[PDB]
Swiss-Prot record:
Function (record text): Lipid transport protein in adipocytes. Binds both long chain fatty acids and retinoic acid. Delivers long-chain fatty acids and retinoic acid to their cognate receptors in the nucleus.
GO cellular component, one term: nucleus
InterPro entries: Calycin, Fatty_acid-bd, ILBP, Lipocln_cytosolic_FA-bd_dom
Organism encoding this protein: Homo sapiens (Human)
Record bears the keyword Cell division: no
N-acetylcysteine found at: C3
Protein name: Fatty acid-binding protein, adipocyte
Phosphoserine PTM sites in chain numbering: S14
Top-level taxon in the UniProt lineage: Eukaryota
A GO molecular function held by the record: hormone receptor binding
Family: Belongs to the calycin superfamily. Fatty-acid binding protein (FABP) family.
UniProt KW keywords: Acetylation, Cytoplasm, Lipid-binding, Nucleus, Phosphoprotein, Transport
Binding site for a fatty acid: R128, V129, Y130
Length: 133
């Protein structure tokens, strides 16, 4: 029942500061513009110890599967090759991506009927709110 309240299909309903987050990460202009337009669905499922998170959008369809605490290699939607570790901290899924001596953290939390995503790169935070599809 690890992650039960995250499981399901979620749709993006608001975003704040995502262009600035992507700038801080190093995403180039054209990718920022097209990716910033995307309205992804986030599909989260669990099978035993394996969690799968799919993001489907007009921009890209991606999928990661992982075990909490166990590092994996990830190719991000903007084509970074990162080393990722996802843990559960006090009911929050915390996803750290490391590449080129840089690091960013993506937190996913349940708040009321929403799934709130906070993306942080240095001093820049973007907040993305998802609702059940
Ligand atoms: C957590 C999360 N991960 N990926 C995206 C995404 C995917 C494709 C294009 C733009 C953004 N948005 C998020 O909110």
């Amino acid at each position: 029942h690890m992650c039960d309240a995250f499981v399901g299909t979620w749709k993006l309903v608001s975003s704040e500061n995502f262009d600035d987050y992507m700038k801080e990460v190093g995403v180039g202009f054209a990718t920022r513009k097209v990716a910033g337009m995307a309205k992804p669905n986030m599909i989260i499922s669990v099978n035993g110890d394996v969690i799968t998170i799919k993001s489907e959008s007009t921009f890209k369809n991606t999928e990661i599967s992982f075990i909490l605490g166990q590092e994996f290699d990830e190719v991000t939607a903007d084509d970074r090759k990162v080393k990722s570790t996802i843990t559960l901290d006090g009911g929050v899924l915390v996803h750290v991506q490391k590449w080129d001596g840089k690091s960013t953290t993506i937190k996913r939390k349940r708040e009321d009927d929403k799934l709130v995503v906070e993306c942080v790169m240095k001093g820049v935070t973007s907040t993305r709110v998802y609702e059940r599809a």
